[PDB]
Amino acid sequence: LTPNQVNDELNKMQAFIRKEAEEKAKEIQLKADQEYEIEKTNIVRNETNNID
């Protein structure tokens, strides 16, 4: 529309993609926590069973 507005369609979409990737990464960190949980529980179970 207005020529001066051509920077807004850049910066707002920059923010939109940034927040998309930010949510993706912040849930990937939760996935990392879940991986932590399972690979901790299974290893400790397997070792402690022989200890028992």
């Binding site: 529309l1 020529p3 507005q5 051509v6 369609e9 850049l10 707002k12 979409m13």
Partner: protein, 747 residues
């Protein structure tokens, strides 16, 4: 919101696009309807396999091959292809004329890939089921001869074409000892090698020797033969007949069943296959055209460039209002004009009434950017040229009759199929109208209607009380027709030798006026460019050289038209005698057109000639210098200096054709009407009828068709090589916005 066709040209722009990648197809549906949109193909120096869209093109190729097979299987059957009126809904200029189509394109691919084998496996059965039926039926008639005799014996059936030779070779290979009786095939049947109803015969044979049996068996096949086996007993043959007869009703019915399926599904598919054809074509084309842009995974945006008109940015934004309406992502502007160093394309608009006129404008060639187009010159001059080619009242009126019929029937002709000979005819239906409406006027001044004249006005001419022909009779003038020429020039060769001289001058004068008018547009575009630094430095000689001679000759010509010479002591100077004097003499005219003109004609000539090298010095004075440009301007100087006179000379063909038409019309009239004048009411009326009919046959056919066909192309000459020589001094590449269109039967 357009151009004036005289000074205002088309003005446009280019930008770098930053469109989101996800709405590529979405944007394409919209801009593909009517957007005045073209792309600068940055996707260059790349191969098909070097491109990121080769995968879908082969899929659409396979489905269109499937559609071609659909064409084939359709036309090979009597059913007619229904075509709905949806093409009008799909061809035209609107606002959302192409509604967006979902991604069910792959569903179309799927169901097509399904139907292909669905129909192949169902159709490839009849070819067998029929031959099995035929073979069983043949076996049946073979067995029908159970009471005809005379492993242990051989049975078969052969065409009558070899019955005699076969029986003879049997008789002369088994050595004259055999039983061989036969019965003919009543109501024969077709063969299988050539599908031909060949007359047939069946035979029966018996012998004692088994060696004989094997010899017969292994000789029969070498020739056109069929083999079978039959029981010797009689009731055994009856049981064979019953068992082989039981299993043929199924064969009789299966073909009917498969047909019932075939036509049933053909009816349904026909309603949609035609539409889907052009539909899927639209998707392949739109994918292709969008594919010319550059994309990488680097950025979510898509790197694209294209070349867009500049006087419709507001309309483009409003139309993209839909982009932000339903599929909105809030990146509205994708337009930002930058600058380049290459010449922009040239393009303009067209209209229904000007289908033919505008085509011929760029058929010769396109003009460069902001270079004036000769639309109005084509509208005016070419029709007037054709009109002045010939002006018989009857011929012009008759030609216009067809034009009126075509224009009034255009209500349905616009939609009905245009015949091979009618395509171009319908293309320029509005041109012949102008042709004729100017032809009737041009011929009006000639006062010719099939070489006749009713003496509309009065001029007054002097004759004695009585006069016997064979003598030259002088009639003085007291005022001629205010409009046109008087009837007095309908007499002997004097009239023709005056009319030819009169007419050969106006042609030259009008040609000079027309070429001056065309050259007048030279500085128009340069002012449009504001390129006045040195362009006038070349327009000046190109004007003065031609004018100082041609305008001087024209003004001299009109000078005698005003002043008489019989009443003046000075005799009338020759029509063209002021040429040699300008060079051999230092100013001596010897024609005495005007005293003072003698001392100024050479002066005008010497100003005219002196600036010959004024063009070869201006170019090097720019600072720098390079050989090709001096060579180019030298060749331009010489070519123009010769082209002025070439054009001057070329204008006589107009009058040559005019007088040729007049003479042929006169001679045809003389050889038709005078012959028809045979006075007889018992057999002469029928002779008059026949002559009248053939006179129409010739007038309409050969005194119009060939003449007009030649005249239009001679006018095309007279327009092109004259105007465009110095008018279209540049070339611009065409603009062709991507848009939907219909497709139909073809390879």
């Amino acid at each position: 919101e357009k151009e004036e066709a005289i000074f205002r040209s088309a003005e446009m722009a280019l930008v770098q696009f930053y469109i989101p990648q996800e709405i590529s197809r979405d944007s394409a549906y919209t801009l593909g309807q009517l957007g005045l949109v073209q792309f600068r193909d940055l996707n260059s120096k790349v191969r098909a396999f070097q491109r990121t869209f080769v995968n879908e093109i082969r899929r659409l190729d396979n489905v269109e091959r499937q559609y071609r097979y659909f064409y084939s299987l359709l036309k090979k059957h009597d059913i007619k292809l229904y075509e709905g009126d949806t093409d009008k809904y799909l061809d035209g200029s609107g606002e959302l004329y192409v509604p967006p189509s979902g991604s069910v394109i792959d569903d179309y691919v799927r169901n097509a890939s399904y139907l292909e084998e669905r129909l192949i496996q169902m159709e490839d059965a009849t070819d067998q089921i029929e031959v099995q039926k035929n073979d069983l039926e043949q076996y049946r008639f073979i067995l029908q001869s159970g009471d005809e005799f005379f492993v242990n014996y051989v049975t078969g059936v052969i065409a009558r074409d070899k019955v005699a030779t076969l029986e003879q070779i049997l008789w002369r290979v088994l050595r004259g000892n055999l039983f061989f009786k036969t019965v003919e095939i009543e109501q024969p049947v077709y063969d299988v090698k050539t599908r031909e109803y060949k007359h047939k015969n069946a035979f029966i044979v018996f012998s004692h020797g088994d060696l004989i049996i094997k010899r017969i068996r292994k000789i029969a096949e070498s020739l056109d033969a069929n083999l079978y086996d039959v029981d010797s007993s009689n009731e055994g043959r009856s049981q064979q007949l019953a068992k082989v007869n039981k299993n043929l009703s199924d064969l009789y019915t299966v073909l009917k069943t498969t047909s019932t399926t075939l036509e049933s599904e053909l009816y349904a598919i026909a309603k949609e296959l035609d539409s889907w054809f052009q539909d899927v074509t639209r998707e392949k084309a739109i994918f292709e055209i969008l594919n010319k842009s550059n994309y990488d995974t680097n950025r979510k945006i898509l790197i694209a460039e294209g070349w867009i008109p500049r006087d419709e940015l507001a309309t483009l934004q409003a139309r993209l209002g839909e982009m932000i309406a339903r599929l909105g992502i809030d990146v509205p502007s994708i337009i930002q004009v930058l600058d380049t160093n290459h010449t922009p394309p040239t393009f303009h608009r067209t209209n229904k009434f000007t289908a033919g006129f505008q085509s011929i404008c760029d058929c010769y060639g396109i003009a460069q950017y902001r270079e004036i187009n000769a639309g109005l010159p084509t509208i005016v001059t070419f029709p007037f040229m054709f009109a002045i080619m010939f002006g018989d009242m009857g011929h012009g009126f008759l030609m216009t009759l067809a034009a009126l019929s075509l224009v009034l029937n255009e209500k349905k002709i616009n939609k009905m199929k245009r015949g091979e000979i009618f395509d171009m005819a319908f293309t320029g239906r509005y041109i012949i109208l102008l042709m004729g409406v100017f032809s009737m006027y041009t011929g009006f001044l000639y006062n010719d209607i099939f070489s006749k004249t009713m003496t509309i006005f009065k001029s007054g001419w002097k004759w004695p009380d009585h006069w016997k022909k064979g003598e030259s009779i002088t009639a003085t003038s007291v005022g001629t027709y205010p409009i046109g020429l008087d009837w007095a020039w309908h007499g002997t060769e004097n009239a023709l030798l005056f009319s030819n001289s009169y007419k050969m001058k106006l042609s030259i004068l009008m040609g000079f006026i027309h070429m001056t008018y065309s050259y007048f547009f030279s500085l128009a575009n340069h002012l449009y460019f504001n390129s006045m630094i040195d362009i006038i430095g070349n327009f000046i000689p190109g004007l003065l050289f031609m004018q100082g001679i041609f305008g001087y000759l024209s003004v001299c010509i009109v000078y005698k038209w005003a002043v008489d010479w019989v009443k003046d002591g000075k005799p009338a100077p020759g029509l063209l005698n002021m040429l040699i004097n300008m060079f051999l003499s230092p100013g001596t005219i010897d024609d005495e057109l005007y005293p003072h003109q003698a001392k100024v004609q050479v002066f005008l000539l010497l100003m005219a000639l002196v600036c010959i090298p004024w063009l070869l010095l201006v170019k090097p004075l720019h600072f720098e210098d390079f050989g090709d440009i001096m060579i180019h301007q030298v060749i331009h100087t010489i070519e123009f200096c010769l082209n002025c006179v070439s054009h001057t000379a070329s204008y006589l063909r107009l009058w040559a054709l005019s007088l040729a038409h007049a003479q042929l019309s006169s001679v045809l009239w003389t050889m038709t009407i005078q012959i028809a004048f045979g006075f007889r009411g018992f057999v002469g009326v029928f002779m008059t009828v026949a002559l009248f009919a053939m006179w129409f046959a010739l007038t309409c056919a050969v005194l119009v068709l060939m003449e007009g066909t030649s005249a239009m192309l001679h006018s095309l000459r007279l327009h092109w090589v004259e105007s465009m020589s110095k008018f279209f001094v540049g070339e611009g590449l065409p603009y062709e916005p991507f848009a939907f269109e219909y497709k139909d039967m073809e390879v």
